[PDB]
Coordinates of C-alpha atoms and ligand atoms in Angstrom, one line a residue:
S1 CA -7.8 72.3 245.0
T2 CA -8.1 73.6 248.6
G3 CA -10.4 73.2 251.6
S4 CA -11.2 75.4 254.6
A5 CA -13.1 74.3 257.7
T6 CA -13.9 75.9 261.0
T7 CA -12.8 74.1 264.1
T8 CA -14.7 74.7 267.4
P9 CA -13.7 74.0 271.0
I10 CA -15.9 71.2 272.5
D11 CA -16.1 73.0 275.9
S12 CA -15.2 76.1 277.8
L13 CA -11.7 74.8 278.5
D14 CA -10.7 74.0 274.9
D15 CA -10.3 70.4 275.9
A16 CA -10.4 69.4 272.2
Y17 CA -11.7 70.9 268.9
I18 CA -14.2 69.5 266.5
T19 CA -14.4 70.0 262.8
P20 CA -17.4 69.1 260.6
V21 CA -16.7 66.4 258.0
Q22 CA -18.9 65.2 255.2
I23 CA -18.9 61.4 254.7
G24 CA -20.8 59.5 252.1
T25 CA -23.5 60.1 249.5
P26 CA -25.8 61.8 250.5
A27 CA -23.5 63.5 252.9
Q28 CA -23.5 62.4 256.5
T29 CA -21.9 65.2 258.6
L30 CA -19.9 64.2 261.6
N31 CA -17.9 66.3 264.0
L32 CA -14.4 64.9 264.1
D33 CA -11.3 65.6 266.2
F34 CA -8.5 66.5 263.8
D35 CA -5.4 64.8 265.3
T36 CA -1.9 65.5 264.0
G37 CA -0.7 62.9 266.5
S38 CA -2.4 59.9 264.9
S39 CA -3.3 58.5 261.4
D40 CA -6.7 56.9 261.5
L41 CA -10.0 58.3 260.4
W42 CA -12.5 56.5 262.5
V43 CA -16.1 57.2 263.3
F44 CA -18.9 56.3 265.5
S45 CA -21.3 54.2 263.3
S46 CA -24.3 52.0 263.0
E47 CA -21.8 49.2 263.8
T48 CA -20.8 50.6 267.3
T49 CA -21.9 48.5 270.3
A50 CA -25.2 50.2 271.2
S51 CA -24.4 50.7 274.9
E52 CA -21.2 52.5 273.9
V53 CA -23.0 55.2 272.0
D54 CA -24.5 58.1 274.0
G55 CA -25.3 61.3 272.0
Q56 CA -22.8 60.9 269.2
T57 CA -23.7 61.3 265.5
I58 CA -23.1 58.0 263.7
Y59 CA -22.0 57.1 260.2
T60 CA -24.3 54.5 258.6
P61 CA -22.6 53.1 255.5
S62 CA -25.7 51.3 254.3
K63 CA -27.2 54.7 253.8
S64 CA -24.4 55.8 251.5
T65 CA -24.4 54.9 247.9
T66 CA -20.6 55.3 247.6
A67 CA -19.7 53.3 250.7
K68 CA -17.9 49.9 250.0
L69 CA -16.7 47.5 252.6
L70 CA -12.9 47.1 252.5
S71 CA -13.1 43.4 252.7
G72 CA -11.1 41.8 255.5
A73 CA -9.7 45.0 256.9
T74 CA -9.8 45.7 260.6
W75 CA -8.3 48.4 262.8
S76 CA -7.4 48.8 266.5
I77 CA -6.0 51.9 268.1
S78 CA -5.0 53.1 271.6
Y79 CA -4.1 56.6 272.5
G80 CA -1.7 58.1 275.0
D81 CA -4.5 58.7 277.5
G82 CA -5.3 55.0 277.6
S83 CA -8.4 55.4 275.4
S84 CA -9.0 53.0 272.5
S85 CA -11.3 52.0 269.7
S86 CA -11.5 49.2 267.1
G87 CA -13.7 47.9 264.2
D88 CA -13.8 47.4 260.5
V89 CA -13.4 49.6 257.4
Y90 CA -15.3 51.1 254.5
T91 CA -14.0 53.3 251.7
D92 CA -16.2 56.3 250.9
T93 CA -16.3 59.9 249.8
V94 CA -15.0 62.3 252.5
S95 CA -15.0 66.1 252.2
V96 CA -13.5 68.7 254.5
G97 CA -14.3 72.3 254.0
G98 CA -15.1 71.8 250.3
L99 CA -12.1 69.5 249.6
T100 CA -13.1 66.0 248.5
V101 CA -11.3 62.7 248.6
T102 CA -12.9 59.7 247.0
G103 CA -11.9 56.2 248.2
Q104 CA -11.0 57.4 251.7
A105 CA -10.6 54.7 254.3
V106 CA -13.4 55.3 256.8
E107 CA -12.8 53.2 259.9
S108 CA -16.1 52.1 261.5
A109 CA -16.1 51.6 265.2
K110 CA -17.5 48.4 266.6
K111 CA -16.0 49.1 270.0
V112 CA -15.0 52.4 271.8
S113 CA -13.7 52.9 275.3
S114 CA -15.6 54.7 278.0
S115 CA -13.8 58.1 277.4
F116 CA -15.3 58.2 273.9
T117 CA -18.7 57.1 275.0
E118 CA -18.7 59.8 277.6
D119 CA -17.9 62.6 275.2
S120 CA -21.0 63.2 273.2
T121 CA -19.4 66.0 271.2
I122 CA -16.8 64.0 269.4
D123 CA -18.1 61.7 266.7
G124 CA -14.6 60.3 265.8
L125 CA -11.1 61.2 264.8
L126 CA -9.4 62.3 261.7
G127 CA -5.7 61.6 261.8
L128 CA -3.2 63.9 260.2
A129 CA 0.2 62.4 261.3
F130 CA 2.0 60.2 258.7
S131 CA 0.4 57.2 257.2
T132 CA 3.0 54.9 258.5
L133 CA 1.1 55.0 261.9
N134 CA -2.2 54.0 260.3
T135 CA -3.5 50.9 262.1
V136 CA -5.5 49.2 259.4
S137 CA -4.6 45.5 258.9
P138 CA -3.6 43.7 256.7
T139 CA -3.4 46.6 254.3
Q140 CA -2.4 49.9 255.8
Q141 CA -4.4 52.9 254.6
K142 CA -3.6 56.5 253.9
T143 CA -4.8 59.6 255.8
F144 CA -7.1 62.1 254.3
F145 CA -4.2 64.6 253.8
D146 CA -1.9 62.0 252.0
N147 CA -4.9 61.1 249.7
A148 CA -5.7 64.7 249.0
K149 CA -2.1 66.0 248.6
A150 CA -1.5 65.5 244.9
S151 CA -4.8 67.4 244.2
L152 CA -3.9 70.3 246.5
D153 CA -2.6 73.7 245.2
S154 CA 0.3 73.2 247.6
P155 CA 1.0 70.1 249.7
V156 CA 0.3 71.6 253.1
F157 CA -2.4 72.0 255.7
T158 CA -2.5 74.7 258.5
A159 CA -3.8 74.7 262.0
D160 CA -5.2 77.9 263.5
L161 CA -6.7 77.0 266.8
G162 CA -8.6 79.5 268.9
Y163 CA -8.3 80.3 272.6
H164 CA -11.9 79.9 273.9
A165 CA -13.0 80.6 270.3
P166 CA -13.3 78.8 266.9
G167 CA -10.4 78.6 264.6
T168 CA -9.6 77.1 261.2
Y169 CA -8.0 74.1 259.4
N170 CA -7.0 74.9 255.8
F171 CA -5.8 72.4 253.2
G172 CA -3.6 73.3 250.2
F173 CA -2.9 77.0 250.9
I174 CA -1.4 79.4 253.5
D175 CA -3.7 82.2 254.4
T176 CA -1.4 85.2 254.7
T177 CA -4.0 87.2 256.5
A178 CA -4.2 84.8 259.3
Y179 CA -0.9 85.5 261.1
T180 CA 1.4 88.3 261.9
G181 CA 5.1 88.7 261.0
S182 CA 6.7 85.9 259.1
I183 CA 6.5 82.1 259.3
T184 CA 9.5 80.4 260.7
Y185 CA 10.1 76.9 259.4
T186 CA 11.9 74.1 261.2
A187 CA 12.9 70.6 260.3
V188 CA 10.8 67.5 260.8
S189 CA 11.6 63.9 261.6
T190 CA 9.1 61.4 260.3
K191 CA 11.0 58.4 261.9
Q192 CA 8.3 57.9 264.6
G193 CA 5.4 58.7 262.3
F194 CA 4.8 62.2 263.9
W195 CA 5.3 65.8 263.1
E196 CA 8.4 65.7 265.3
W197 CA 10.7 68.8 265.6
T198 CA 13.2 70.4 267.9
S199 CA 12.4 73.6 269.8
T200 CA 15.3 75.9 270.4
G201 CA 14.4 76.7 274.0
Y202 CA 12.0 78.5 276.4
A203 CA 11.3 81.3 278.7
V204 CA 9.0 81.7 281.8
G205 CA 7.2 85.0 281.9
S206 CA 9.5 87.9 281.5
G207 CA 12.5 85.7 282.3
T208 CA 15.5 85.3 280.1
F209 CA 15.4 82.8 277.3
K210 CA 17.1 79.4 277.9
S211 CA 18.7 78.0 274.9
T212 CA 18.1 74.2 274.9
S213 CA 17.0 71.7 272.3
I214 CA 13.6 70.1 273.1
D215 CA 12.5 67.3 270.8
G216 CA 8.8 67.0 270.7
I217 CA 5.7 66.5 268.4
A218 CA 3.1 69.0 267.2
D219 CA -0.1 67.3 268.3
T220 CA -3.5 68.9 267.8
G221 CA -5.1 65.9 269.4
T222 CA -3.4 66.5 272.8
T223 CA -4.9 69.2 275.0
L224 CA -1.9 70.2 277.1
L225 CA 1.8 71.1 276.7
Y226 CA 4.0 68.2 278.0
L227 CA 7.6 69.1 278.5
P228 CA 10.7 67.8 280.4
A229 CA 10.4 67.9 284.2
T230 CA 13.2 70.5 284.5
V231 CA 11.3 73.0 282.2
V232 CA 8.0 72.4 283.9
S233 CA 9.4 72.7 287.4
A234 CA 11.0 76.1 286.3
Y235 CA 7.6 77.2 285.1
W236 CA 5.5 76.3 288.1
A237 CA 8.1 77.6 290.6
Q238 CA 7.0 81.1 289.4
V239 CA 3.4 80.5 290.7
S240 CA 2.9 80.8 294.4
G241 CA 1.4 77.7 295.9
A242 CA 1.7 75.6 292.8
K243 CA 2.7 72.0 293.3
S244 CA 2.7 68.6 291.6
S245 CA -0.1 66.4 292.9
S246 CA 0.1 62.6 292.6
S247 CA -3.5 62.4 293.7
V248 CA -4.7 64.7 290.9
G249 CA -2.2 63.6 288.3
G250 CA 0.0 66.7 287.7
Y251 CA 0.7 70.3 288.6
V252 CA -2.1 72.2 290.3
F253 CA -2.1 75.8 291.4
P254 CA -4.3 78.2 293.4
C255 CA -7.2 79.3 291.3
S256 CA -6.5 82.8 292.7
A257 CA -3.2 82.9 290.8
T258 CA -2.3 85.0 287.8
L259 CA -0.2 82.7 285.6
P260 CA 3.0 83.8 283.8
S261 CA 3.3 83.4 280.1
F262 CA 5.5 80.7 278.6
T263 CA 7.7 81.2 275.5
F264 CA 9.0 78.4 273.3
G265 CA 11.6 78.8 270.5
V266 CA 11.2 78.0 266.8
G267 CA 14.7 78.5 265.4
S268 CA 15.5 82.1 266.1
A269 CA 11.8 83.0 266.5
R270 CA 9.7 82.9 269.7
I271 CA 6.0 81.9 270.3
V272 CA 4.4 83.3 273.5
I273 CA 1.7 81.3 275.2
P274 CA -0.2 83.8 277.4
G275 CA -0.7 82.8 281.0
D276 CA -4.5 82.5 280.7
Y277 CA -4.0 79.7 278.1
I278 CA -2.3 77.6 280.8
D279 CA -5.3 77.7 283.2
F280 CA -7.5 74.5 282.9
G281 CA -9.8 75.4 285.8
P282 CA -10.9 73.8 289.0
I283 CA -9.8 70.2 289.4
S284 CA -13.4 69.4 290.4
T285 CA -16.5 71.6 290.4
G286 CA -16.2 74.2 293.1
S287 CA -12.6 73.5 293.9
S288 CA -10.1 76.4 294.5
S289 CA -7.3 74.2 293.1
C290 CA -6.8 74.6 289.4
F291 CA -5.2 72.3 286.9
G292 CA -2.2 73.4 285.0
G293 CA -1.9 73.4 281.2
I294 CA 1.9 72.7 281.3
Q295 CA 2.7 69.2 282.6
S296 CA 5.7 67.0 282.7
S297 CA 6.3 64.5 279.9
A298 CA 8.3 62.2 282.2
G299 CA 6.8 58.7 281.8
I300 CA 5.1 59.6 278.5
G301 CA 8.4 59.1 276.7
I302 CA 7.9 62.1 274.4
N303 CA 7.4 65.8 274.6
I304 CA 4.1 67.0 273.2
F305 CA 3.3 70.4 271.8
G306 CA -0.4 70.1 272.2
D307 CA -3.2 72.6 271.9
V308 CA -2.0 74.8 274.7
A309 CA 1.1 75.6 272.6
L310 CA -0.3 75.3 269.1
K311 CA -3.3 77.6 269.7
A312 CA -0.8 80.4 270.4
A313 CA 0.5 80.2 266.8
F314 CA -0.5 79.8 263.2
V315 CA 1.0 76.4 262.3
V316 CA 1.9 75.1 258.9
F317 CA 2.2 71.3 258.4
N318 CA 4.3 71.2 255.2
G319 CA 3.9 67.7 253.6
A320 CA 6.4 68.4 250.8
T321 CA 8.8 65.4 249.9
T322 CA 10.9 66.7 252.8
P323 CA 8.3 67.7 255.3
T324 CA 8.8 70.7 257.6
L325 CA 6.8 72.7 260.2
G326 CA 6.2 76.4 260.2
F327 CA 5.2 78.6 263.1
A328 CA 4.0 82.3 263.1
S329 CA 2.6 84.5 265.7
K330 CA -1.0 85.7 265.3
Ligands
F91_401 C1 -5.9 61.4 270.2 C2 -7.1 60.9 270.7 C3 -7.4 60.9 272.1 C4 -8.8 60.3 272.5 N1 -9.1 60.7 273.8 C5 -9.7 62.0 274.1 C6 -10.1 62.8 273.0 C7 -10.6 64.1 273.3 C8 -10.8 64.5 274.6 C9 -10.4 63.7 275.6 C10 -9.9 62.4 275.4 O1 -10.6 64.0 276.9 C11 -10.7 65.4 277.1 C12 -11.7 66.0 276.1 O2 -11.3 65.7 274.8 C13 -6.5 61.4 272.9 C14 -5.3 61.9 272.4 N2 -5.0 61.9 271.1

């Protein structure tokens, strides 16, 4: 089997991407944030604290003839931005782009933090990291991809994120029309539960390539590109007037600037992030100070190849017995 679903930016900055997901019988369609940096499928629901719901579409398991309470199971998660959610668990039929998993753990939110409430466009998360990160207790659950894998034509999914435009998540096949050149594959460590790999280096604009190993994760659930402070300083030094702002929370630059591109290595191959991809707009409405899309990972504890980087490529998440990651230009 295969599935293919369009993913759509939630706003004009590509702050995140939402993909429609069919849950239950009859289907309840919710727009979820496909997250290769986590491993829980959780939704806003009829169980969510009423004052914590504002505009989201909710899952109502009592309206689904195939929902079953997973008795005794609970879940609790917190993300790198300090956001969190928690609740209980149902199993139900979940379909993505025509690919159907029965018996999928659907984690029903009772509680969500303010960031979630405040974003009416995201109805929940669909985690696509490894199932060892799943937070259900006392019986850990599998991710949609792990449950689907044995059914798929090939044990892969691909992420093709758009720059200020829709893109695609495919399951079980590689669309050879969706990228240019060839796909370069690179090893993955599953030790921390992530799609963790090692970039071979970087370049700033038309600068020479610096060969250096950068361990990091491919994270569709993170907006920005988070890299070591040395790398990030080298980037922003090429932009007149850019500076790191403690008040704002990272590098800002004059909105009048033209940003340089940023190249990262994948083995011997190179992916180029155009400068416009690195512009996240005014720090506040009307400001002439703009927020940078490349930020330091110092204090995070990990380098993160978030949407700013991944949207510049066609990315293959190969879930074979020995997983690997593939990157192609597009
Ligand atoms: C997974 C989930 C989260 C949850 N927080 C979150 C999700 C989407 C967002 C967001 C915040 O703030 C910017 C707009 O889009 C953050 C990181 N990885």
